[PDB]
Amino acid sequence: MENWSALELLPKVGIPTDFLTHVKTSAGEEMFEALRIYYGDDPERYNIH
Amino acid sequence: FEAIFGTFCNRLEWVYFLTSGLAAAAHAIKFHDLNKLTTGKMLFHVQVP
Amino acid sequence: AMEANIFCTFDHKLSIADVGKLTKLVAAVVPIPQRLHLIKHYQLGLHQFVDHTRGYVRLRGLLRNMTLTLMRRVEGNQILLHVPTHGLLYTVLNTGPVTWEKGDALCVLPPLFHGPLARENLLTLGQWELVLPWIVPMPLALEINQRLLIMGLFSLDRSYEEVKAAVQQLQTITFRDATFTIPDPVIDQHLLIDMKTACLSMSMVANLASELTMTYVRKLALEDSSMLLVKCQELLMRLDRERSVGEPRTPARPQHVSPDDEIARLSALFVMLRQLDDLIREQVVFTVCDVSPDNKSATCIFKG
Amino acid sequence: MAAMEANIFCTFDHKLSIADVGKLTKLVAAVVPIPQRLHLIKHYQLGLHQFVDHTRGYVRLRGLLRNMTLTLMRRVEGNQILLHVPTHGLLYTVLNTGPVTWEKGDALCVLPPLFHGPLARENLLTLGQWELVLPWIVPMPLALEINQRLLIMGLFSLDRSYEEVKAAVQQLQTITFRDATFTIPDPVIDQHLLIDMKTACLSMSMVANLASELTMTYVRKLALEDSSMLLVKCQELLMRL
Amino acid sequence: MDARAVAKRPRDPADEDNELVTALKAKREVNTISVRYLYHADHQALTARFFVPEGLVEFEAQPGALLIRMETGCDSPRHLYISLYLLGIRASNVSASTRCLLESVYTASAARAALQWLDLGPHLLHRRLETLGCVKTVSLGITSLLTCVMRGYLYNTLKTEVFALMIPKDMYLTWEETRGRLQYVYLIIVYDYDGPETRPGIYVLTSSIAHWQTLVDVARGKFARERCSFVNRRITRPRQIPLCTGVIQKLGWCLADDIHTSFLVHKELKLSVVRLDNFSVELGDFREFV
Amino acid sequence: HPGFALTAVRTDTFEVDMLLYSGKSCTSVIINNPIVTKEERDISTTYHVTQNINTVDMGLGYTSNTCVAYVNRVRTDMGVRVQDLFRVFPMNVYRHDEVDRWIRHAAGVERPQLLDTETISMLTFGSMSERNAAATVHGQKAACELILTPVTMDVNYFKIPNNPRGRASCMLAVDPYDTEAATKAIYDHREADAQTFAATHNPWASQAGCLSDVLYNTRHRERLGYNSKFYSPCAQYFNTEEIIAANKTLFKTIDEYLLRAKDCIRGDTDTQYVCVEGTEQLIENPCRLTQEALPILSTTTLALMETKLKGGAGAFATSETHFGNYVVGEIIPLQQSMLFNS
Amino acid sequence: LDKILNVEAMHTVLRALKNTADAMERGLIHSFLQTLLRKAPPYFVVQTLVENATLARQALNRIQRSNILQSFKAKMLATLFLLNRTRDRDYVLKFLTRLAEAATDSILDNPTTYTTSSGAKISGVMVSTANVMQIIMSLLSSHITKETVSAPATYGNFVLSPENAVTAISYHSILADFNSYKAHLTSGQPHLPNDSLSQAGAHSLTPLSMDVIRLGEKTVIMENLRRVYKNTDTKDPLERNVDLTFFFPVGLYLPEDRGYTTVESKVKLNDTVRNALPTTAYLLNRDRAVQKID
Amino acid sequence: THCQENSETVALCTPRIVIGNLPDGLAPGPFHELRTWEIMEHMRLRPPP
């Protein structure tokens, strides 16, 4: 798969986003290639092997 | 006598990519090691209010 | 100066683990339908010619005309593919099942993987795979080429236990190396269209000639310059045992045949050799001089 | 000896009109054979013309043309022609002299020309009672059926009344390949066809005594069980049962 | 892509220093090896090294002699590299005097193995062979490592001398009375059928003919006897399927002025052989024919 | 009148302009230096000048869109000329000889027993059999054919844009990635149909394995010998093995619609043929996305047709009936507009 | 006589090089248009999404898919050809501004590039054949205003940092501006100033005249491309073809029991069984002319 | 149909021969009478004897 959580630690730019009809749908109808959505607070961001 | 008046040539017109207005969509960037790179990926991390 | 090549690109993205699979085939033949310069991966390889109903002979007949090409150097985002020149030595990877000794005359054949699985799968990519033609010594091609033609002639006779067993014997060649059974062309009780047309090309030549050649041999044998056509008139009889005390003294010849149809039968005899010609004469495409240890690479002078 | 030359210079002797040297400038990169293969050839030995004979036989040409050294013309000019002997396996352009159109990927063959019939090319390059005939380059299938027609003419010729042979040859010579028609120039039964008659009847009769009991029987087995369009006409050529 | 860049003449490798010199000029290190000039750098000939056991070296020390592989059954001696001369003992064309002459020369178990493996098989001779080219630079040891040309001219290293093809005189034949300026050499095995075994007769047939059809047409002329004997065996024996009666393979070419007699000299045994001198090798393949 | 009815489908190709729109900096195009490889034919040296480009997209949603702006002219004949199946399936023949001789002479198709290698090849495969005709005054032509029940309702089925197959197959309704449920909705007749909730408006096409399925599903057609050069307008409705595989989440679907949904059609020859795949412009086909087909103007009799040509601007759209005879009004006023507007 | 050929060869080389460079530029234009034509959904798709954006807060329910499909089908038949049916200026203007309002904003937008003189800021470009823009200049002459756009003048470059050579070799991966991440991770700061693709290119800008349109505070560029396709052998990618499958019954049988007859005051068919059962059907050609299928 | 053999449910395809076999669902009763008036019209029997 694609390694996430590098993404939650590597400083990202920050940019005004724009998707018609919000984000959850266009992440749910497979507009984007790879995606992952977590609900609580996945402590994987904290594990660094 | 049978007269050949002037011989004539088509004069070509050059067009350039950046001169075109369609380049308003592109954001062209040279990258001399482009044949090496397999794929380029951009990752987005948007939290939902 | 740079060597002449043919660049190839993959419409579908490539994985880091995928591009490593190409470095394995960097020295392997990759047939191309047509000489061009830029080529999408779709037109690359033999997979475009896969069919469901069409069989081995379709692949062979189109494979004769495709432009052979080695892979040269993976670029990550591109692939070079050198077109071999006649009379210069090129190394080739041993995709064929059989090990090559030095001096062998190799030739290209469609892949002939049989039922139980062995190492086959490499480069699944977007519902697409890079099938590669077998490279095989000339005699093994001459033998495989006939095994299929005989299983085709038996495709009509699967009720019999004797043919049922003989087909199995033709199915498993026994070569000077590990053995490789040949897939049966017959399937679903019914023969594929290519082998059927080829078997017709053979049986027409086998039958149309027998009734036709007597009208000509009877006339040629008169001259006697060659001195064997009289002996050939007896060869026409197709008797196996010595003749009984009965009918045969001369071969059977057609009677009265209407003046024009004899031209049409004659020309239809020649139309069937053209259908058969793709299988009649295999052609060498490489002649290996030295072989690498483990018979894995070879360095063949190119032919064709 | 001096090895066979790659570049060969051809010199005309007859006075060349300013009009005619222009035909050869348009004739560049054509397929022109020579028998001799020396470095400084005469114009007399150019092309197929030297082998025209009173016999007026087409197969004599097909046979003598096989032995000639094919050359590709190059760098034509006043006073000089520069034929090139091609090397095996190396690429070359080839000018399309004949009307036949060339599909991509088709193989080519060299056979003596087959005049259209009613019309002939004007720019013959005839000079001094020496015409410049050159062999046609045709796709392989047309070169196959021209020879198949010639051989059928040779086989049918024997054992048939001479009036019947006229009716057959009247049609065996015309060929409609690729929607163009063509006609064999004076095809004639000869000794040159006779030896081929002998070899064809011999190989085709030794074929009859090599097919297995099942190999001949396969068609009977097929038609009695399955039928299709291919099989209808094969049921016809099988005369009776 | 500049206008001048296409205008440049093609650059020959001798004009540029050797690639090893191009590295040593950059890095200035000086090995004991003389990389100032590379040997064998101008060789259109393609070659291959073949280990051949010492029982087969005789009459091959002279550069120029066919190498023909011979597949035989047994998996341990997978092949064996026969000369053209060693194959002459089996041929029926060869003179009995020449045959008994040279048969003494092959008094080795390695060579006698060749006669045994020739006798062993029911299948025809032309199947088991695959010509490899011509000898040069005999390694000449307890086990010679013969260098064999696959294509191009035979010649010395440094091109100081041109090795010549040697063909034993009894195998050499010419069809024509007026030799052409150039003529091709073809090797021709021709089975003449006979009761206990179909004995082969080898020949080497130089001819200006190149076209296959005209070549086989002229060949059936002299070989009408063998062809008619094949047809006669075809009807004499039922359920016997004997195949092709001669087989021709293009062996290369020579200028037809070079041809002249000579003799090989070995163990004080003169052997008359025709000598094509500047024989370029260009291998073909066996072409079955009736 | 024999017992059955026909429901010909017929694609028509329109030359047209597009207008694209795209945002600023909608996709970056990284490029490297062009490199010039060289080749030689010894009569002339071609040089080839490659260049590499990769286009990262720089928009989360769709940054660009398109509309069909202007129809200039029609390429297709819009004639009837139903497709000759005798050339689409050249191999098949009646077992009896005399009956097939008689049928060929009645239907107008015949083959001459020359065994021309062109005839052998054609019966074997392809060969582009038709060889265009003397003077084409209209253009490309085709029609298709579905044997059907006369009882077929039309007021619920033929007046409105709908599926020729007889059973609606819009994978957009079906749950994504649901093959067990997508195979019921397109095939099963116990589960109630989409648009009209009757199980099957035509049984002889909507069943799995019906005559029209085995006749036009290319997966079925392959097992019989058939000419692949000829383009069949109906097959897109019956290639069920592919459309079952097309149902995917909405955006994968509208990405698929831009890439494969096109159907190349050869443009110079008289009749439609499958082009050398992707060599030409691919022809977009919106009806493929919905798996429906648009009614065109049809009348049983001339009297109802005269009233249309005599009538007002809106005349062609209104459908009418007369005790047995009907007029199926067009959904799109192209017969009013592309023609009269000129 | 020889110097003439010596000069003619040089001129042929220069011609074969200038024309190939120009073909390269036109091929780059062509490929960038081919890319958009593959990433550009049709109008009705974007419009349905732009109308049903609110309701679908989650992966859409079984019912919402049906609403969306219905809207696709409706928009398709009422938007298929626009300049062909309608030319109402107030409606064509509404449709074109609807096309711009339906397109989503790009990730990165550099204020400096493509700025019209006098403070205007461009948003996108729309392209079409000549005969279309000639209709638009007539219908919207009020809004189109030729202006001097400040386009970027040179390609950018994306040079690799020294640290990237190691990560490319050991790990087969390259993150842009590795050295900036090392600083922001050590210093603990979360945001990045720029994400490197806006970092590269377009430092030098040059003017060029363009036509722009006001689409409700949007300024879209209008650009014809037929200029680059004159006398070329490649078909314009914007000219396309659209297939439409049609289907018609022939030879049906309407019920006798529940039979009925609207118009009958208009026609009067002769009493005959041939008038009773339909056996044929009638259509019309490309040019209007009666056509028959028996 | 699906006939029931010796504890099997073997399927049985069988030619329809006459046009009347089509089910009265697909070729209703009045349809055949209307079609027969077509045939008696074709024979010039529109008023039958």
Numbering used by the authors:
A (entry chain A): 1 to 49
B (entry chain C): 50 to 98
C (entry chain r): 3 to 306
D (entry chain q): 1 to 241
E (entry chain p): 1 to 290
F (entry chain C): 1029 to 1370
G (entry chain C): 148 to 441
H (entry chain C): 540 to 588
Sentences copied from the publication:
Here, we report sub-particle cryoEM reconstructions of HCMV virions at 2.9 Å resolution revealing structures resembling non-coding transfer RNAs (tRNAs) associated with the virion’s capsid-bound tegument protein, pp150. Through deep sequencing, we show that these RNA sequences match human tRNAs, and we built atomic models using the most abundant tRNA species. Based on our models, tRNA recruitment is mediated by the electrostatic interactions between tRNA phosphate groups and the helix-loop-helix motif of HCMV pp150. The DNA confining hexon channel is “secured” from the outside by β-herpesvirus-specific tegument protein pp150, whose N-terminal one-third (pp150nt) is resolved.
One icosahedral asymmetric unit of the capsid consists of six types of heterotrimeric triplexes—Ta, Tb, Tc, Td, Te, and Tf—located at geographically different local 3-fold positions. Tf and its corresponding pp150s are smeared out by the local 3-fold averaging due to the icosahedral symmetry imposed during previous reconstructions. Using sub-particle classification, we released the 3-fold symmetry and obtained a reconstruction of the asymmetry structure of Tf at 3.6 Å resolution. Like other triplexes, Tf contains one copy of Tri1 protein and two conformers of Tri2 proteins. After this symmetry relaxation, a tRNA-like density along with the underlying three asymmetric pp150s emerged. However, this density is weaker than the tRNA density on Ta. A slight change in position of pp150nt-c on Ta and Tf, which alters only the flexible interactions between the CCA tail and pp150, dramatically reduces tRNA binding or increases the flexibility of tRNA.
